[PDB]
Scaffold this active site. Structure first.
Site, short mmCIF file in Angstrom:
data_model
loop_
_atom_site.label_atom_id
_atom_site.label_comp_id
_atom_site.label_asym_id
_atom_site.label_seq_id
_atom_site.Cartn_x
_atom_site.Cartn_y
_atom_site.Cartn_z
N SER A 138 0.80 -1.07 0.10
CA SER A 138 -0.06 -0.05 0.01
C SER A 138 0.92 1.25 0.08
O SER A 138 1.38 1.49 0.80
N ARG A 139 1.22 2.01 -1.21
CA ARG A 139 2.15 2.49 -1.50
C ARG A 139 1.93 4.03 -0.72
O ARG A 139 3.07 4.45 -0.31
N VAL A 140 0.77 4.59 -0.46
CA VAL A 140 0.62 5.79 0.18
C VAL A 140 -0.35 5.71 1.38
O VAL A 140 -0.95 6.42 1.90
#
Lengths: 187, 501, 470, 50, 100, 469, 101
Positions: free
Chosen positions: G68-70
């Protein structure tokens, strides 16, 4: 017989008509009758544009043919046999196309040619005549080969003139010369 | 000055005549027009669109004749007339192209102004017969030892450089040109290869770097650079080798020897792929219509070692197909492999392994000649092949690290030193007179002992030593080019003299 | 009658459609010649599209064609010249001598659309060709009137093998030979011409014991397809009309396959598997059936094949694998081993390899060879990582014999004085059966592997053993 | 030599746009009218010569 | 407008000439075009499916595609002599081979 | 011109018009259809004759009624350029989609433009330090350079770019262009916010950056000339303003992708893997318009969302043709936890050399490559057997390669947040020194984990002390 | 579809439409056109581990292929503090069992 094949535009269908009625040698008659039926179709524009738009059945299309010969019983039997084909294939969009093509074939058979001397401006009748003389004098338009040199105004050919007919053109204009002049003085 | 040149230019235009052909554009868009009319159209002829675009015509149809535009779409307009140039495509061919970058239509794009070409020729000239060939006897030395030894290159011979893209793909070819500087410097005209580097699909910046490298190595003088940049049209890209070929044929015909690098034909194939599918021709295998083989074959067969009648002038070809993923089963790579007289497989893994140049020697072959290399060098590298062949088997045993037979590990030990000997840094070729010693040392096993790490050190020093003392020996190798008994013994003594110490 | 005038309508590469005169067309497979400064462009009629418009395939260049251009009709199938006065001439696809020793033909021309003879004519005579090449003779004997197939990589000794066959067999055997070149180089052509002038098979004075038909790949695909057909008819003239047995040679038939696939696509015929013509089988069949051992004659074709990436389960080789009587696989590995010929020993299977049709003695010896080699090969895998330290003495002697046999295969060839530099050795059938037998019995396990290398029979093997010994 | 060549090129492109200015000047004039007559009589001369 | 096999110019010109080729061509046929060994025959309107039809080239065929205008015969015989307008009589007996 | 027309067809967003009057348009002209959806911009792409064109539609399609007036606004669409475009986010029509109100400008220029000639070239490549060791070592950057990233599905393609922008473009005072083709709106909001915050866009002030952002949702045709619009902005800066330029492009797979979609519809046989036959011309044109001239040497950074990671697909293949450096990034190497995630045997630069960055650098890199290639080779042996069944010499190599690999793990700066580890940026001079020592095994004797996720050699040492504690 | 899901700004009322698009990958082979096309749009993926599902995590979340990149800039401080980066830690667990063999 064909008065020279016209194909590339599905004009072979028209050619077939031409040669078939040429073999009956009723081509002037055919052409005149074709003009009359085309004209009364156009001059019946409601359902002579929308009856030129297919949506008709076998029976209704056939009954449209019957209505067409109600429009005039002088029409030449060969283009009426062509009508049977057009009803059966339900084709009729290239009907005025066939009229035009039969005309092209007819006046090709006659050997009459049209012509234009496109310029970016109106062109004198003296110019038409003098060029017509020159052109008739040239072997390019002989005799038996008619020519209708007309003015066209097309600013596409900016100034100058281009004489056009028979896939043979003489373009002595300013635009082409300017193109070449610019290019050569960009060398 | 500039005024005078312009005054000549203004003077240079005046008067024209009736155009007996016409046809009116209809289709236009997709950069391929199809025009209605044109029956006088001779096939492959060049037709001048009234826009100012020129397009040759490759498809003739009784409807609309398909004229492939070289020029821009917007300039062309529907209903324009096109007037036939009346000439099938032709290029100026001569010697004026020597020291010139030219685009596909032969315009000096380096802008060294006009070209002193001694003719114009046609790009559809067909390959010379069986009778117009002569036996191949003209060595070509690339300055990369492995190439000469393993895949000896003659003249009038096709060697396909194949392998992964831009792994110095350009650089391998440039190395050949650089050792061919030695023959070029040499006044023997028939040994002066006028090198024609054809660059298809490449950007102007890349090309600009290449021309900078070539001008730096001042080989540009005899080089001709024929280009079809990334910008340049797909028909022009297709036409570019065939017009490059015409320029080459002028040398070949004259009895002069020349060399044509076709880099990269893979982008030519894409260009023909595009061209054909927008001539609406049915897609071939991998969207390159079959007859692409016919196209390539006619092009490639114009590299020929001609008869003594034809002055022995041999245009030599080096095709270059940059195989993506080494996919040689791809239709165009399969096709080319059959046509060509050698394959020079290169491998990326071996590049990573640090073998630079990185050559997959197992699939690198030269099916033709050995008079395609020097007699002396043939003698020394006779068992270079054998050692290496044994090495391949031995290396397999060596992998998995199982306890090798001492004999196999002797091979392994010898083999390793050879591998380090082959490697060469780009833009540094080596003169054959001094490639014969290095191979002698290795093959006569004197290097087998010398440790792998200091093979590179040894190599450099060995060359220095031979320059100092046995420069007489080098002169003899240069002068006589076949190792005599005396040379083999002298060389053995010299090698011993510097292998020990 | 009158050469029907047709006007070209569409030049779309090789496919050129012609608009022959109304109510008059030629029949499929006829030949049109169009007078040009390119002589006669030959168009093979391959479809009629009706409306007196045919679609024909060009075999020669289509440049400068004016759409509307008059096309004369020869009126009938492409008829090449056939004869015994074709011997010693190089003749291109359109039957024109490109060694230009004037008009060839005996007194006849024949169509190249010659039919495959019926079942009744075709009667298989199992007769034994002998190449004198020991491996070839012993482990897969070749047969007269056969349809030998040299599957291999491009010139992986393929050219060499044929040259050796010509050197030995062609001059030796009374029948003529025909060398047919399908998409082969003019470089290769110059070598072949020179080589067969050298072997004298091209007898410079008078008749040669071979004729040549050299076809080139530069020529449009149509010519590539029907150079094969052209050559076939000359062989047929020998087979049929003059009765004469032949020893046909074609090179590479992959070029024929490739050519046919292309013009199938060009004809519009939707390419089938791996882009290859759906009509591959019947074209192959037509070719193969035409070549036959009949009452009339016998034709011993040897057809070179180029196997893409040495993978022959690829449909173009794999279909051919069925169609050829006596397959032989040659490849890179054996070539690299420096063995002449490049034949893969355990991969190759000729028509004859029966247990007594090749002779019981011959068979038994060859069975013994197969076992010896098969043992070495099976054990090769164990030795590769683990070593030979875990294998027995008996096994080791079998490995040693196989290695000796492996290089016993290496037999020099005179036409690979070009390659190896070593003049050939020819070993009679009886001599081979005997020479191989001895080794297997263990009578020559005292002869080093390299004293089997690049030598002929047992006498030579012993002599090189002595040479290496001292 | 490099700037000398550059100056010739610069001179040529300056004089090129000056040529464009004369082209725009010609196409304004009723030389634009009079040269249609010139083209007309030239086509008479050419086409009579055809 | 569109391509139709009856609009083939020879067929079309006769129909325009007030001659319809039907009746004659219910069994027989005339080849319109034979290319790829796929003669497309105008006629055979009394054909039963997969019926055996015999050309005047002596060729026998079966008719895998029955379309109203054309019957796409697949030839058991050869193409070599075959040409446009070939008389195709309808043998009128579906494919049969001796059994016994 | 007032070429009236009708919309004869609306076959998708490849509307076909029938210009009623026989007045002719020209290819690459632009047309305005005026609707209650404002103007809709179409671009003439074919003339099919009879004055019936086939037109690419830039803006959205729907509501259209056949027989709808057309007006020809001619030529290529005119963007607005000047220094007063610096700081704006621009649509394609010049509209400020960051809504800073109508873009103030000097000269407004056509979207289409010619690619500078062979003669116009002036190709130069410097050294440019990215402050990233792996990048510097394997592919030294350069001014005017063409960089290419062949990363995953924006898995950190964006992250990589953002870090590069953070370092290089805030260490470059000259103009820089961000053109983001068919990329997600949120990325744009983040970027815009960040830019405004980091003053590269001073909102009230001037910006040394300009931005073009094209959202993925926007019709394919718009995305095609989003690029062309950006190229015009770049050309104005390069040429007319003369100033040093940089350019960033992401996602240029979308540029290719958009083209392939329209191609089929246009009526062009879509070549292999459905990709347009005109792929080559477009990629070529773009990369020959972005080119190093004496006017300005344009550093370009291109980010390719490799489709399913197939680089042999024609679109990545043709990208390789016009690049001078690549730094292909492997999704797998990201999973291994290595950030940077760049594949190291698939990185190249023309400026990696034995004199372009020195023999010492080249040797250092060579050994890293050789070591890693060996390690990759021994992956089979390691797995089928073990590492204790490897030779001692090899076991050292393996340990070295594992250490080197871990050394390559070097925290991200912009994504210092996202990774959650403070960024590690290391000078080029420092990098050469650090790798030289490590290769000489001088620091190979300290935890592999110490090498993991840290910067320079000194940092590894310090983290060894941390691990020791 | 996807870009109509957003966290709006204060002018627009800050309202959201959180999109979580659920892709049913047969075989879970995420190198594949449809999955990759989604991945480029999204920030984060939630790949699930079948082996773990069988091995009694119902449901079973593969954490190698869940990202979950951000993600953590949505998180509130309690949930920023408590987790120091368990993913890093468990990518040391991943490494440990990687090199266990």
């Amino acid at each position: 017989p064909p008065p020279v094949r016209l194909f590339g535009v599905e004009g072979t269908y028209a050619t077939a008509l031409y040669q078939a009625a040429a073999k009956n040698s009723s081509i002037d008659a055919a052409f005149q009758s074709l003009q009359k039926v085309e004209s009364t179709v156009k001059k019946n524009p409601k359902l002579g544009h929308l009856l030129l738009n297919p949506a008709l059945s076998l029976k209704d299309r056939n009954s449209v043919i019957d209505a067409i010969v109600e429009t005039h019983k002088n029409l030449d039997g060969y283009v009426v046999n062509l009508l049977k084909v057009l009803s059966e294939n339900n084709r009729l969009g290239c009907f005025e196309k066939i009229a035009s093509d039969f005309g092209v074939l007819n006046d090709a058979h006659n050997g009459l040619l049209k012509g234009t001397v496109t310029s970016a401006e109106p062109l004198d009748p003296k110019s038409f005549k003098r060029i017509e003389k020159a052109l008739s004098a040239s072997k390019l338009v002989g005799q038996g080969k008619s020519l209708k040199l007309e003015n066209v105004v097309k600013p596409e050919i900016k100034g100058g003139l281009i004489v056009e007919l028979g896939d043979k053109t003489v373009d002595l204009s300013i635009s082409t010369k300017i193109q070449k002049l610019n290019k050569v003085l960009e060398d | 000055e500039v005024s005078s040149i312009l005054e000549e230019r203004i003077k240079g235009v005046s008067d024209e005549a009736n155009l007996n052909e016409t046809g009116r554009v209809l289709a236009v868009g997709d950069g391929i027009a199809r025009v209605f009319g044109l029956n006088n159209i001779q096939a492959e002829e060049l037709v001048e669109f009234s826009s100012g675009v020129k397009g040759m015509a490759l498809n003739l149809e009784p409807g609309q004749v398909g004229i492939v535009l070289f020029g821009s779409d917007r300039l062309v307009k529907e209903g324009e007339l096109v007037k036939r140039t009346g000439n099938i495509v032709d290029v100026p061919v001569g010697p004026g192209l020597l020291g010139r970058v030219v685009d596909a239509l032969g315009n000096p794009i380096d802008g060294k102004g006009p070209i002193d070409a001694a003719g114009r020729s046609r790009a559809q000239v067909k390959a010379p017969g069986i009778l117009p060939r002569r036996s191949v006897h003209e060595p070509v030395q690339t300055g990369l030892k492995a190439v000469d030894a393993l895949v000896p290159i003659g003249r009038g011979q096709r060697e396909l450089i194949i392998g992964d893209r831009q792994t110095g793909k350009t650089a391998v070819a440039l190395d050949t040109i650089l050792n061919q500087k030695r023959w070029n410097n040499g006044s023997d005209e028939s040994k002066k290869l006028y090198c024609v580097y054809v660059a298809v699909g490449q950007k102007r910046s890349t090309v600009a770097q290449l021309v900078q490298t070539l001008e730096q190595h001042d080989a540009m003088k005899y080089s001709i650079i024929v280009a079809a940049t990334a910008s340049e049209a797909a028909p022009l890209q297709y036409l570019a080798p065939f017009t490059a070929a015409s320029i080459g044929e002028w040398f070949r015909d004259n009895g002069k020897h020349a060399l044509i690098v076709y880099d990269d034909l893979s982008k030519q194939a894409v260009a023909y792929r595009q061209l054909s599918l927008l001539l609406r021709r049915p897609p071939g295998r991998e969207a390159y219509p079959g007859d692409v083989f016919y196209l390539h074959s006619r092009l490639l067969e114009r590299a020929a070692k001609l008869s003594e009648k034809e002055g022995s002038g041999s245009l030599t070809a080096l095709p270059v197909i940059e195989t993506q993923g080494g996919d040689v089963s791809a239709y165009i790579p399969t096709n080319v492999i059959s046509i060509t007289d050698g394959q020079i497989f290169l491998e990326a893994e071996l590049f990573y392994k640090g073998i630079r140049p990185a050559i997959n020697v197992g699939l690198s072959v030269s099916r033709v000649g050995s008079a395609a290399q020097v007699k002396a060098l043939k003698q020394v590298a006779g068992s270079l092949k054998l050692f290496l062949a044994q090495y391949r088997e031995v290396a397999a045993f060596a992998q998995f690290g199982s306890d090798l037979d001492a004999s196999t590990k002797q091979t392994l030990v010898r083999g390793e030193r050879l591998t380090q000997l082959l490697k060469q840094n780009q833009y540094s070729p080596l003169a054959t007179e001094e490639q014969v010693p290095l191979i002698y040392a290795g093959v006569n096993g004197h290097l087998d002992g010398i440790e792998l790490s200091r093979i590179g050190e040894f190599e450099s020093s060995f060359l220095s030593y031979l320059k100092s003392n046995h420069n007489e020996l080098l002169t003899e190798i240069r002068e006589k080019g076949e190792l005599s008994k005396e040379l083999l013994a002298s060389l053995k003594s010299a090698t011993e003299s510097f292998v020990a110490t | 009658s009158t050469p029907i005038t047709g006007k070209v309508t569409a030049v779309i590469g090789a496919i050129v459609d012609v608009h022959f005169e109304q109510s008059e067309l030629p029949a499929i497979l006829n030949a049109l010649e169009i007078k040009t400064p390119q002589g006669k462009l030959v168009l093979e009629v391959a479809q009629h599209l009706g409306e007196n418009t045919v679609r024909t395939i060009a075999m020669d260049g289509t440049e400068g064609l004016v759409r509307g251009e008059k096309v004369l009709d020869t009126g009938g199938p492409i008829s090449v010249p056939v004869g015994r006065e074709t011997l010693g001439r190089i003749i291109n696809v359109i039957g024109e001598p490109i060694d230009e020793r004037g008009p060839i033909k005996s007194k006849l021309r024949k169509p190249i659309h010659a039919d495959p003879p019926s079942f009744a004519e075709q009667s298989t005579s199992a007769e034994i060709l002998e190449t004198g090449i020991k491996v070839v003779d012993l482990l897969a004997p070749y047969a007269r009137g056969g349809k030998i197939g040299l599957f291999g990589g491009a010139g992986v000794g393929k050219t060499v093998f044929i040259q050796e066959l010509i050197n030995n067999i062609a001059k030796a055997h009374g029948g003529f030979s025909v060398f047919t070149g399908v998409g082969e180089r003019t470089r290769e052509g110059n070598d072949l011409y020179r080589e067969m002038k050298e072997t004298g098979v091209i007898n410079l004075e008078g008749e040669s014991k071979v004729a040549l038909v050299f076809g080139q790949m530069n020529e449009p695909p149509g010519a590539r397809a029907r150079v094969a057909l052209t050559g076939l008819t000359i062989a047929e003239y020998f087979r049929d009309e003059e009765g004469q047995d032949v020893l046909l040679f074609i090179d590479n038939i992959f070029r024929f396959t490739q050519a046919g696939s292309e013009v199938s696509a060009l004809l519009g015929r939707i390419p089938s598997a791996v882009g290859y013509q759906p009509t591959l089988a019947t074209d192959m069949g037509l070719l193969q059936e035409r070549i036959t051992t009949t009452k009339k004659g016998s034709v011993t074709s040897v057809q070179a094949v180029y196997v893409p990436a040495d993978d022959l389960t690829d449909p173009a080789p794999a279909t051919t694998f069925a169609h050829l009587d006596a397959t032989t696989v040659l490849s890179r590995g054996i070539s690299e081993l420096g063995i002449y010929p490049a034949v893969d020993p355990l991969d190759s299977k000729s028509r004859l390899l029966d247990a007594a049709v090749v002779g019981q003695e011959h068979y038994d010896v060859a069975s013994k060879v197969q076992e010896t080699l098969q043992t070495y090969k099976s054990l090769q895998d164990i030795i590769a990582i683990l070593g030979m330290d875990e294998l027995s003495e008996q096994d080791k002697l079998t490995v040693e014999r196989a290695r000796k046999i492996q290089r016993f295969l290496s037999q020099p060839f005179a036409v690979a004085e070009v390659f190896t530099g070593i003049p050939g050795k020819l070993v009679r059938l009886k001599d081979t059966v005997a020479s191989f037998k001895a080794v297997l019995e263990g009578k020559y396990d005292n002869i080093p592997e390299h004293a089997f290398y690049m030598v002929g029979g047992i006498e030579d093997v012993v002599a090189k053993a002595e040479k290496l010994a001292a | 030599v490099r700037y000398e060549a550059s100056l010739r090129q610069l001179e040529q492109r300056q004089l090129a746009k000056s040529v464009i200015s004369r082209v725009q000047s010609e196409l304004g004039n009723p030389k634009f009218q009079e040269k249609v007559l010139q083209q007309s009589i030239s086509e008479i001369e050419q086409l009579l010569s055809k | 407008t569109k391509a139709q096999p009856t609009e083939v110019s020879s067929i079309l010109e006769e129909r325009i000439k007030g001659v319809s080729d039907e009746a004659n061509l219910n069994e027989t046929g005339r080849v319109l075009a034979v290319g790829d060994g796929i003669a497309r025959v105008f006629g055979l309107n009394n054909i039963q499916a997969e019926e055996l039809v015999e050309f005047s080239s002596g060729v026998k065929g079966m008719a895998l595609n029955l379309e109203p205008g054309q019957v796409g015969i697949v030839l058991f015989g050869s193409d070599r002599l075959v040409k446009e307008g070939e008389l195709v009589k309808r043998t009128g007996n579906i494919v049969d081979v001796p059994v016994g």
